[PDB]
Every structure is written in C-alpha cells, then in structure tokens.
Symmetry: D2
C-alpha cells in the first residue's frame, strides 16, 4: 500500500527509530541525528547525501542495511539526509484466461512468456472469457500451438464467442513480440 | 514503413499476384479468385475465413506459405477473404547512453536487461548524456555495479551533471524490476 | 516418475483405452485399432506415422488431443503407430542457499537469474551453507550487490566460512554469464 | 584465447604495469608493490586480499578500475595479493541450421529461445543440415510452428532426410523446456 523504510540512529538497528511512508526532504525532522542503520520493508527508495534530495545517491532495496558502508559504494561520505520512494516503471505483457464467462471461475494469468501447455501449469479448465491487459497474443485450441487460432489483443472478451472460439477451449498461448512495420 | 503481404492465385506463389499494405475486407477486390499461396514480407497480419474480418482466424508471420494448409491449422476450410495488419503491443524498457553531451557521439542502447560491463559490449567511451525512454535504472561508475550510483528514470539527461555524475563515467547499469508498494 | 500417455480407439477419449509408460514400436499391440484421441499426463512424447518410430513425426505435450487433426499439422495422414517419451535436454543454472550449516533449515533455490534482494523473495534467514549445482555466482552481504562478495562455483559449502563469509549473511546473488576467454 | 588483466602500481593506470594471463598466487612477484589500478581486458578474474588466494574476495569484470575502492565493496582493506581467472560455468541450448548438406553454406545459430520466423532473422535459405549441440527442439516447415514437425535432439543431421524432412525446408523452431517425468 505504501513504501516503508525505517531509519535507526544506531548501527545494528539500534536506538531511536523512525518509520517513513513517503519522502523526507530533511531527515533531521525525524529526530534521528545521523542514520546508522536502515531497514527497508517496502521499496525501493533512493536516499541522498544532502537535504532536499541533493548530492550522492544511494538506492535501497528490500532488506537490511546494518551500517553506512552497507549503502555508500563510494564510501565517500556517511551522510543520509533525504529519502523518497521510487515509482518503478516496469511494463509487463499480461493476459488472464478464466474458466467461466464474464471473468469468473478459475483463472490463469500469463506474464510475457509463451505457454505451450496449460495442463503443465495445472490449468485444465475450459476457457470461457479472457482479459488482455497488454501485449498481442495468439490462443490455440490444443497444446503446442495447434488447432484453431484466436488473435487476442488488449481488451475484454466476456464470452468465448467474442474471441471466435466455437467452444471454450484453449490449451496454449504465445505472445507476438515483433512487427516489421 | 507499411506492412506488406502478397497473395497469389496459385500455390507456390504462382499466377496473378497482388500486394496489400493495409486491410482488405474483401480480397475478391484484388482480382485473385481464391488465395493459393501467400508471401509475408512485413507483418504480422491476421487473415479471415470470411469477408469483413469474420470467421476462422489465421495469423501470418514473416515468411512463405506455399499452400492453404500452411496456414489453416483447423484444415477446416481453405477460404481466405479478408486481411489486416496487426498493430503489436510490445513494451520494452530501454535506455540509451551517449558518449558526448546532448545525445551525441557514440551511443549504447540497452533493452530490458542488466549489463554488468559496458566494455564487454564494446562500449568503452565515457557517458556524458542519457535518454531514458522507459524503465527505472541504476547506473554505476565501475563494472559489476560498483562506485557511485545514479538513479536513471524516464527522461533526458543532456549532461552527466544532470544525473549527478562528477565525471562522464558509467560502466554498468541494472534495471529495477520490482516495487513492494 | 514415468512418462504417461493414454491412447483411445475413439475420438473424445472414447472406447478402448490403453496407458503407455514407455516406447511402443507397434501400437496395434495395445489393442487399440487406430488412435482416435490421446491424453498426455506426463510428457513430452513423440509419435510416429509408422511403426518402429518411422514416417511423419508428431510431438505431444501435456494436455488433451480429442481428434487426429489435433496432432498432425500436415493433416497428411491420420495414422499413429509408434510412440516414445522424449528425454528433454534442458540445462539450468541453479544455487540453493540454506539457513543452517550442512544444508539444513530454510532454503532458497535460485534458477538462472540474478536476485538483488532475498527479502523480496521472502527469504530473510541467515545463510550458513550453499550448494552450487551449476553456474558461476557471486553472493553479497547486502541487497543490491553490496558489501563483501563471495565467488560461488559448482560445489558444496557446508558452512559460511567455506565461502569466506565472516557471518552467515547473504542478501543478494548474481550469476556470471560471460567469459571473454 | 587467454584471460588478460593488467595491474598498475599506481592509480589511474599509472606506473609500473604488469600483464597476467593466468593465476598469480603472489602478485609481489610481478614487481608491482601494491596494486593501485587494474585493467581487465578478458575476464572475469577473482582477486584476493591475501596471497595464495586467501582472505577477502573481489571479482573483476571487463572494464576499468582506476583506484582500490573501485573494487573492495567492504572498503575493509586496500590489499590485492593474488589473482586467478574464473572458469565460468554457463550452459546454453544451441542449434545451428545450415543452408547446404553437411554443415555448409549459410548458417543460423539459435541460442535458447524460440524463433517463430526465420525470415524475420534474415534467414531465408532452405535448411539442409542441422547440428544440435544441446537442448530438445522442434523444427517446423512454415512460420508460426506450422506444417510438418521434426524433433531435433543432440546430434548431427548431415542431410534433411535424416531429420525426416521431405524437402530442406524449415521456417520456425521452438525449444522443449519441460518434462513431467
């Protein structure tokens, strides 16, 4: 829901502690004199050498940082004065296939890759509706990309007829990754 | 520039031929009585069993289709009456690093992956400007993700100072793929 | 444990059925006159047009094949006379990190990719022993490939001292994928 | 041919320099008193804090290291006394398809991934022989995994007949990545 990082006045997560859920242009404001240890529970975050998000940068990933050298590659400075969460830009291609019409029953989500066999994913229900959130996909009736093919583009298919299936049957899907125009 | 597919009245790319650069809701219009062979030079395209982009679907990828069974998995019908190019939705994470300021000199493009060493890619120039088109990246001064770190988010950095580098030096980059908020 | 495929005399998995757990150079031997439908539960398998694993080839992946055209792209022939499982050659790079010495306690397996943060995988125990089954890896004390580095090559490390850690602490790992010699 | 790394007595690649093409259990032997800068041209290499490949570890990737802090994350010690190249264990799945029999003419190498269209790779010759070095692959006559299928396992196919092709025609290939036994 929120990013979450905890700063400690002392190493080893010792001393006065302070939780942040958003940017802090001036950490002195949290009462902790000079961060000594940091604990990141929901990130990532970028911390700065100076206030206002200026000077040397340090990116913090989920995990434990028990001392300043754990985060300053340069080992330039031990100063940590500003923090902010990072909104990561990370684009996947995703399609969700559902057992029943209208996006109900068992579901199967596929992120970016091709799947030559749904039963090998434990999916063995029929496919009555599909939601394509991104990417260009091709669904096939049988495993190994065989039988009738259905082009699946961004959009909602509430029923199998909408994608052209004569029966709510899909057993493989592949993503179209290239265009030569 | 345009998609390009050529339909032949006969198998083996024989007979009256017709080039399409866009959708054809009714192939009879091209003079070719019943497509016998198809050649795709810039795709992909989706063809349909009936006019107006109705009935069984067939997706065509760059390559040669010398006969109807080469494209109809069902082998249901041999009918090909409508065609249209497919606009593929395919999202990459890309960053371009340039030798000189302002996006000039030698360049290096990185698509989605991490690169622990620029010299192993043949890139050994300094890095003075960066263009991030998508993704969240972290640039480092030395190979193996060492030294000063620079967070690189969508945007243009005309000079190294804009990304916080004290010198136009970058030798590794990694992409931030997850957020826990 | 064994591959498993079931052949039916009739379409739709109807009629006399027969389970195979190994190669059948002559399917007539199973009593089913001409396979009509096939069900693959543990594969893949390769089937042949003629006996003895001769003629047209058809590869079967986990899933349901309710009729012959579901498996013969050519749609050449409807004949299925020999079957054999395929031993797939599929090489991964794998490392397992364990909470306690000697390969005990909680464990974390990593297949081929880099992991910048163990806590983001739900792993937050210390790392006392490592098993590297394949690949060249580099373990680091903190997230984001920071702190002491430990080169991890094929082999068993029963205790953290064997990999050179001063403490059973590892929070990131990356695989070395290239050599320039 | 050999790994190659050059050690300099001074920072910025200054001073007495020494090239290594193999392990050096005691760098004092090269005349350079305390490495100040390192240049890696063919690696990777692992360096050690003490002689004989003991103490803190530092992995060196192709690139420039102008000062000691460029390589010691700990920033523990500035000592570099032993070096050795790393033999990387890195397993790919590779298949090479050739225009003419016997592994001659134009060639196309495929490493690990599926290729739905050879013409989209610029390959438009026929395929008369195949070398599979690793992996389990399936070759198809037309693009998009259509037409006759040929199972391609580790081994040499000097002519198209050996893989069962009736014509030296292959336009797509996919790798079989899973086995359920």
């Amino acid at each position: 829901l929120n990013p979450k990082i905890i700063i400690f006045e002392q190493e080893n997560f010792q001393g006065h502690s302070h939780e942040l859920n958003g940017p802090c242009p001036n950490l002195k404001e949290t009462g902790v004199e000079k961060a000594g240890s940091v604990l990141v529970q929901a990130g990532p975050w970028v911390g700065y050498e100076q206030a206002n998000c200026k000077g040397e940068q340090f990116v913090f990933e989920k995990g434990e940082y028990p001392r300043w050298d754990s985060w300053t590659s340069s080992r330039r400075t031990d100063s940590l004065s500003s923090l902010r969460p990072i909104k990561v830009d990370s684009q996947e291609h995703k399609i969700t296939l559902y057992e029943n019409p209208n996006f109900t029953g068992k579901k199967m989500e596929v992120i970016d890759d091709d799947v030559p066999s749904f039963h090998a994913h434990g999916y063995q229900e029929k496919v009555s509706s599909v939601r394509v959130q991104s990417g260009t996909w091709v669904g096939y009736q049988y495993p190994g990309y065989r039988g009738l093919q259905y082009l699946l583009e961004k959009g909602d298919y509430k029923d199998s007829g909408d994608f052209g299936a004569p029966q709510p049957q899909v057993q493989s899907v592949r993503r179209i990754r290239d265009m030569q125009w």
